[PDB]
Ligand binder design. Sequence first.
Ligand code: FES
Length: 106
Amino acid sequence: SKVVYVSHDGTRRELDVADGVSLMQAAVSNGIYDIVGDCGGSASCATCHVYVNEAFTDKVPAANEREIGMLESVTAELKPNSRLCCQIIMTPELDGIVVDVPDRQW
Ligand code: FES
């Protein structure tokens, strides 16, 4: 399914992500440099921060307690639609999901 990573300067980068693969994993393994994913996807860092387009925030499973806690430490502006994309697993329903990436993770 399709996923669009919009870098902070507006560049739209589309990737085909297989079901069950997290947005972070697909990102860091396909040149999406503005996403670090340092902890490896256990909601243990804030380096996979992204802003989920409001047309998809409802279809994504809500952030668990751990992510909520980690999000508090994001280095870029924390917004209502901020999410640690390693916590978002790709599924067909999410096809076309768009995420805007901040100008910094560290
Ligand atoms: S890769 Fe560390 S919280 Fe997402």
